Design a protein around this nucleic acid. Structure first.
Lengths: 454, 162, 69, 62, 459, 269
RNA sequence: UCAAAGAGUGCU
């Protein structure tokens, strides 16, 4: 009768060549691969342990740093390995981040360098330019010889100087055009080919503590004042647009490159506030993991990540959609973080602290900069979801969430939980008897008032 | 921002295409420098696109004279034109800064790079040599370098069989 | 199994499951538990002292002890 | 037969907005031993990407 | 709804990918159907099948007769390259039938109940009388387990790296090979364990006792999952299908019981067995094997809900509803010690006191094997690569559950004396305050939810 | 990544089974032979013969499908993935083999011929892309410069670009006399067809070659001086005379070869 | 020779 049996062809499974790769038969019958749910979990848990192994954020420091505390970091938005820094010594440096060496160093200003910005002045490849301002009441334009291209072969040094009636405290440059804005006692609009301020913008008599041009609607400008105010400006109208007064001053402002109407604010009240430019009566998001005043804030060019440099000697990385830091970077070598900028590839973090060093940190502590094989790739992204999937697994939370934090920070953290708990208990006691006490939204407590109501 | 790399071989000129650009900030990191040594990693960075062998001994010397003086020979002008797109401006990696202005004069549409990043790629090509040529007939470089040696060095001194 | 790699070692350790003096080690240990407990029993007891002497004489009578102990 | 608290998720992970959504995705196997090589590649893929050594400009006018 | 919908299609896409790979599978199982309706699958005799199969398969069938330490229990490795056969009087030899080389030879003269490979061919554990001994591929014994005493059953869990032993002492030992430690020690309370078996789906042990109750056991929990009696008499053997849907047993009272694990219901009951089964086995394909005395009878498509699928000895007037034995083999003047299917090949091994014999049965093995899980062609270096990885992926004992799908769901001096007094007063106040808050809450709920006495109600 | 290639073909066999052309058993056999090749091509020591063998095997599968289409379906073309997939995949293997082994001129040659035969299915732009890489990889091989020149002067009849190919080739290979001959031969071909068209135009109602002659002597002489002299000049006055004589003898044979070319063209003076 | 264990080389 008819018989057939399982029959193996030896040549098919054992190659005739010694060098030919043996065939790997595969069957996706679910029964043949039992314990899915235990398995993926174990691969998840191993990944979290491995992630903490490779979490090696520090890479190095730029040269020998600055003499005094570094208080102005300006990044070249058109180049990866170009950075401009300045310290209270009055010295400004232009760095080759690739070689961790300085292109050039200038004793630019007699006083403290209060602002820096890299520009491409359109005077009416072989060189780059940067603009510096300080409290000595002058703004100077400098030119830097660079080795980016070899199509030529100098004139390296001061190019032009702008004198001002009052001290200059902040500077930002328009992206599309050569115009740039300075923030001092009055926020002034300047043109490169014009020695005196082209236009005068000001809400009122109050001074301006920082300014940041939008990266997308580059014609929009925002500023911060010493009166705990944030003022929005429009270049098409050449006038201020909106003002909101908050409970406590904001030190830095940055616009989300992926969301033009959306910007984050670095505040002194341990918080960074995420604001929509259209409706400022409330915030979009608030970030509360710092233990001292937040000095600087920056957006990822991917737009999904924000850092905040704080006076508490730590740098914290936040997701735009999550209000708590996923990561904390710190070192005893870092004395007071005043500036935190990104490598505009979104892969490295640049920090400036008053100890005089500008440090480089990995955005992703466990990621490595080397080119990986497809097999190396396919395994690494296999972990990141499998960690994402089982993120709230308690042991996965325990191993993943843990970070080494300085003792001053936790002793600051544990106490604020106590004052906050005292406030909630004591306020909650009033909910028992007080008939009319409105509930105050977290997103509106920081706002004291807005000029234009809607 | 590199796309094409010009490498000179004693047998001829080979231009390469940069498929992947190595991280510029982390250039000095341990792992990336190892990738230059590792052939498998490097082949992902670049690929051989062209090779133009010299016709004979005479061409190698007169090009060897021209490469040294930062000059562009007819062979260099010929090979580059067929490869680099007219195009904003195409970027070419050259080991020599002095050769850069010569290339720009003939070809206004190409911008030259000779920074350490370009040097890093050029070093790797020399490290592996004909292994990157993937079988293309380059004879063997070592004797060609040696053969071009008394061709090049010994020309400048003006001896004679006299 | 084969030598485990560094990351393999850190994740999993003590996975290397699956002249010998084991008996003499047991002989030595057994002698210890006697003298330890013979100390536990009160000193004035006559039963402990004779039992201590029988041990000392006998390991002597062996030559485990070269001299009386 | 009481379930072990050790293996129970504390709260619903992001991006899923409801408990039943996660019990569904959780019944996906992401592993390749259950998933074809290609089908692995659509599941494997992260949302945020980048290419090393290139310029991420702000978005141009749409 | 769109999110719930969107999640849905990837499954219909994912199963479509699974359907896509089903075509990739190189070969199919065997068949044996008669050309003529008169021809019967039970009528065909084994020698005729030996003629039909090719030369290599005839070599793949093994028959060796040896009587020194009879009877001999046969055990088969998961990957299946290596056979382990243990003699009753104490002789155990580990060998690979395909290659034809013996891995190690043990001539120990101690009565042996069972033996089994643990993780690979390299290390295997053999159950001696009153103790458990572990032997290397070289034949050297590495360690002996004092905790494991008088165990007639050896059973190892691959994904969890745990060896479970059942003995007449009734104390169930849970030992993990990698850690070299005994995970847990448990007493059944059902007396000596006559039958031992594991369900691959949930990695739950199944035990057999005289009362007939079957206790489902796991390392994690103190007392068993489930207690089921299917056969009135002692359960000699317990068989669980590869899927884990179906669980089969044969009582000592000649009863055969087909059961469902997930629903814990009884599929089919057969009391027509002439004599109680020696052992009962189930194929990966789902085909069941039963051995009674010298006769071994096999039924195709037995594990189905339909009554027509019910196994029935022979037939009642050739009734289509009656299910005839697919293959009937009898060893004259012989007794079957145990049955072990041959995963990854189309054969059934049968153990006897005269020797070990392997019978060729179409459809017995799985058509196609996944390389990642197990490979008959695994080379020496990858089996180490597979070994270390499976260690790295070791499943914890506490991860064991009744259902793999359930796991992962979402739910000094005086001053110190004064110190205690204040803390007591501080603690006492919290109780008082908490009482007032509770009372006030009750008032909120109560508020939320004779003519003369009314006149005097004010007073 | 052998499995990836195996998975890309799954929709097709499903189409083959769905249309009824190939049984699941026959389909499995095609898969098994396919699997062996993919592992062979992705492995170590792979050679071009592996690519040729797979291409030849895959070509046969296409022929049987075409025969079975008329035999079973009784249709010239069934509108489904099966028709263009075997044809698409063959080009994919050619790309990998040519990419994997750029050296073998033979393998490139079938690629051009295979795509040329399926002119409707492969646009002439795809033939252009193959030549651009091939000329770029082997610029010093005269046969390829005349190759693409011949393809398009006949199939497409673009004299401007056919002039361009030769115009590039002579730039890289000014010393090979064969390339000059074909570019002259093309030049007189263009003139004669132009004059013949002019004659036809009347019925219904060259110096440029001689210039190519002129420079062709000059550079061939220059290169022949560069060769036979090596790295350095020749000091002896006498040898320089033989060097001149050798060029004159070499050069005249080059000229005499062209005098034979003139005889072929009757219309030209 | 098999048989278990190391340490380098080539190459995907």
């Amino acid at each position: 009768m008819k018989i057939k049996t399982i029959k193996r062809s030896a040549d098919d499974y054992v190659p005739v060549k010694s060098t030919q790769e043996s065939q790997m038969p595969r069957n996706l019958n679910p029964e043949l691969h039992p314990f899915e749910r235990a398995r993926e979990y174990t691969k998840a848990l191993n990944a979290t342990k491995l992630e903490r192994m490779f979490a090696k954020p520090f890479v190095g420091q730029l040269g020998y740093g600055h003499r005094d505390g570094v208080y102005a970091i300006a990044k070249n938005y058109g180049s990866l390995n170009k950075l401009a820094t300045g310290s209270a010594d009055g010295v400004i440096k232009y760095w080759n981040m690739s070689t961790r060496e300085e292109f050039v160093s200038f004793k630019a200003h007699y006083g403290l360098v209060t602002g820096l910005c890299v520009t491409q002045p359109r005077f009416h490849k072989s060189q780059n330019f940067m603009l510096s301002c300080s409290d000595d009441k002058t703004v100077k334009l400098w030119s830097i010889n660079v080795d980016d291209y070899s199509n030529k072969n100098n004139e390296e040094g001061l190019i032009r100087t702008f004198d001002g009636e009052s001290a200059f405290q902040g500077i930002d440059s328009h992206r599309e055009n050569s115009t740039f804005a300075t923030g001092g006692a009055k926020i002034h609009l300047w043109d490169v080919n014009r020695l005196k301020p082209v236009s005068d913008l000001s809400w009122g008599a109050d001074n301006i503590t920082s300014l940041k041009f939008n990266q997308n609607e580059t014609d929009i400008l925002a500023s911060t004042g010493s009166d705990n105010s944030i003022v929005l400006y429009d270049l098409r109208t050449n006038s201020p647009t909106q003002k909101i007064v908050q409970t406590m001053r904001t030190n830095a402002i940055c616009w989300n490159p992926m969301e033009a109407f959306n910007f984050v604010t670095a505040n002194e009240d341990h918080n960074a506030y995420y604001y929509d430019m259209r409706n400022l009566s409330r915030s979009l998001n608030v970030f509360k993991d710092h233990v001292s005043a937040v000095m600087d804030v920056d957006f990822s060019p991917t737009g999904d990540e924000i850092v905040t440099g704080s006076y508490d000697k730590s740098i914290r990385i936040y997701k735009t959609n999550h209000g708590h830091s996923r990561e904390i970077y710190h070192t005893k070598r870092m004395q007071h973080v005043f500036q935190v900028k990104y490598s505009m590839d979104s892969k490295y973090i640049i920090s400036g602290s008053d100890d005089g060093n500008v440090r480089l940190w990995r955005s992703k502590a466990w990621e490595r900069s080397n080119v990986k094989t497809t097999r190396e790739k396919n395994k690494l992204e296999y972990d990141e979801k499998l960690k994402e999937r089982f993120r709230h697994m308690p042991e996965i939370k325990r191993i993943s969430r843990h970070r080494h934090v300085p003792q001053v920070i936790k002793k600051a953290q544990e106490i604020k939980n106590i004052e906050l708990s005292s406030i909630k208990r004591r306020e909650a006691n009033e909910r028992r008897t007080r008939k009319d006490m409105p509930y105050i939204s977290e997103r509106k407590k920081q706002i004291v008032g807005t000029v234009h109501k809607y | 921002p590199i796309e094409y790399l010009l490498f000179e071989e004693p047998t001829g000129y080979a231009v390469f295409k940069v498929k992947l650009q190595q991280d510029d900030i982390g250039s000095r990191l341990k792992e990336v420098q190892e990738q230059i040594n590792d052939f498998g990693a490097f082949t992902k960075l670049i690929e051989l696109v062209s090779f133009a062998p010299f016709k004979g001994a005479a061409e190698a010397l007169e090009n060897a004279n021209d490469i040294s003086e930062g000059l562009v020979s007819e062979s260099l002008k010929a090979i580059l034109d067929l490869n680099l797109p007219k195009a904003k401006n195409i970027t070419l990696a050259i080991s020599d800064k002095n050769l850069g202005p010569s290339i720009k004069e003939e070809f206004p549409y190409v911008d030259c790079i000779s920074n350490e990043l370009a040097q890093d790629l050029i070093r790797g090509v020399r490290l592996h040599g004909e292994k990157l040529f993937k079988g293309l007939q380059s004879g063997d470089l070592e004797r060609a370098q040696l053969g071009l040696g008394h061709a090049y060095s010994r020309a400048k001194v003006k001896f004679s069989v006299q | 199994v084969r030598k485990l790699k560094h990351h393999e070692q850190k994740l999993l350790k003590k996975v290397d499951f699956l002249e010998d003096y084991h008996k003499y080690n047991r002989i030595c240990g057994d002698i210890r538990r006697l003298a330890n407990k013979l100390s536990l029993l009160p000193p004035t007891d006559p039963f402990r002292r004779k039992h201590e002497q029988l041990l000392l004489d006998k390991l002597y009578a062996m030559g485990v002890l070269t001299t009386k102990s | 037969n009481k379930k072990n608290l050790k293996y129970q998720s504390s709260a619903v992970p992001f991006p899923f907005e409801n408990r039943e959504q996660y019990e569904r995705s959780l019944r996906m196997p992401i592993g390749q031993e259950w998933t074809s090589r290609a089908s692995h590649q659509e599941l494997i893929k992260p949302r945020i990407m980048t290419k090393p050594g290139q310029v991420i400009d702000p978005l141009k006018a749409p | 709804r769109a999110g719930l919908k969107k999640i849905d299609e990837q499954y219909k896409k994912a199963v479509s990918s699974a359907a896509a790979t089903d075509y990739l599978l190189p070969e199919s199982n065997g068949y044996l159907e008669p050309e003529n309706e008169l021809e019967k699958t039970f009528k065909v005799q084994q020698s005729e099948i030996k003629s039909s199969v090719d030369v290599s398969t005839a070599n793949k069938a093994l028959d060796l007769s040896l009587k020194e330490f009879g009877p001999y229990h046969i055990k088969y490795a998961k990957n299946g390259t290596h056979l382990l056969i243990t003699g009753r009087k104490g002789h155990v030899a580990s060998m690979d039938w395909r290659k034809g080389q013996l891995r190690a030879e043990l001539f120990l003269n101690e009565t042996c109940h069972s033996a089994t490979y643990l993780q690979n061919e390299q290390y295997f554990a053999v159950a001696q009388k009153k103790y458990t001994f572990i032997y290397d591929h070289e034949g050297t014994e590495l360690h002996r387990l004092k905790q494991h005493i008088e165990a007639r059953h050896l059973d190892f869990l691959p994904y969890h790296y745990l060896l479970v032993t059942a003995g007449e002492t009734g104390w169930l030992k849970y030992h993990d090979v990698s850690t070299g430690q005994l995970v847990s020690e448990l007493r059944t309370k059902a007396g000596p364990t006559m039958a031992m078996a594991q369900n691959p789906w949930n990695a739950v042990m199944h035990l057999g006792h005289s009362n007939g109750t079957v206790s489902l056991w796991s390392p994690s929990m103190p007392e068993p999952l489930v207690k089921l009696l299917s056969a009135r008499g002692p359960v000699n053997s317990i068989a669980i299908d590869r899927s884990g849907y179906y669980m089969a047993t044969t009582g000592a009272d000649r009863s055969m019981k087909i059961w469902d694990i997930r629903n814990f219901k009884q599929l089919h009951s057969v009391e027509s067995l002439p004599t109680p089964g020696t052992n009962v086995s189930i194929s990966d394909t789902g085909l069941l094997a039963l051995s009674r005395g010298p006769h071994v009878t096999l039924w195709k498509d037995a594990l189905k809900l339909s009554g027509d699928s019910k196994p029935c000895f022979g037939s009642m007037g050739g009734n289509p509803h009656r299910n005839t034995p697919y293959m009937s083999h009898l060893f004259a003047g012989n007794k079957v010690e145990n049955l072990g299917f041959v995963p990854f090949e189309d054969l059934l091994g049968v153990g006897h006191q005269t020797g070990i014999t392997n019978l060729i049965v179409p459809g017995a093995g799985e058509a196609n094997y996944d390389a990642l899980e197990l490979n008959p062609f695994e080379t020496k270096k990858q089996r180490q690569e597979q070994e270390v990885r499976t260690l790295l992926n070791k499943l914890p004992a506490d991860t064991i559950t009744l259902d793999p799908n359930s796991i992962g769901s979402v739910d000094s001096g005086l001053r110190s004396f004064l110190r205690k007094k204040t803390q007591n007063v501080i603690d006492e106040r919290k109780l008082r305050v908490q009482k007032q808050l509770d009372k006030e809450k009750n008032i909120r709920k109560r508020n939320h939810q004779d003519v003369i006495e009314e006149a005097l109600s004010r007073f | 990544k052998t499995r990836y290639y195996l998975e890309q073909c799954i929709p097709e066999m499903d189409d083959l089974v769905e249309k009824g052309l190939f049984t699941k058993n026959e389909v499995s056999l095609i898969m098994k032979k396919r699997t062996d090749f993919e592992h062979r091509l992705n492995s170590r020591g792979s050679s071009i013969n592996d690519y040729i063998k797979y291409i030849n095997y895959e070509s046969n599968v296409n022929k049987l499908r075409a025969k079975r289409c008329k035999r079973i379906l009784q249709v010239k073309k069934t509108n489904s993935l099966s028709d263009w997939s075997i044809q698409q995949r063959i080009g994919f293997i050619y790309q990998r083999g040519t990419n994997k082994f750029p050296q073998d001129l033979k393998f490139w040659a079938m690629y051009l011929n295979y795509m040329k035969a399926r002119g409707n299915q492969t646009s002439y732009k795809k033939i252009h892309n193959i030549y651009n890489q091939l000329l770029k990889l082997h610029p010093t091989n005269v046969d390829i410069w005349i190759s693409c020149a011949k393809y398009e002067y006949e199939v497409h009849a673009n004299f401007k670009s056919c002039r361009n190919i030769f115009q590039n080739g002579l730039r890289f290979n000014p010393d090979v006399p064969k390339l000059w001959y074909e570019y002259v031969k093309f030049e007189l071909n263009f003139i004669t067809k132009l004059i013949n068209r002019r004659k036809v135009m009347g019925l219904i109602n060259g110096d440029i070659a001689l210039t190519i002659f002129d420079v062709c002597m000059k550079t061939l002489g220059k290169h022949y001086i560069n060769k036979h002299k090596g790295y350095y000049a020749i000091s002896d006055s006498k040898m320089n005379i033989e060097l001149n004589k050798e060029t004159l003898n070499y050069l005249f044979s080059e000229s005499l070869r062209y005098i034979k070319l003139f005889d072929e063209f009757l219309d030209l003076e």
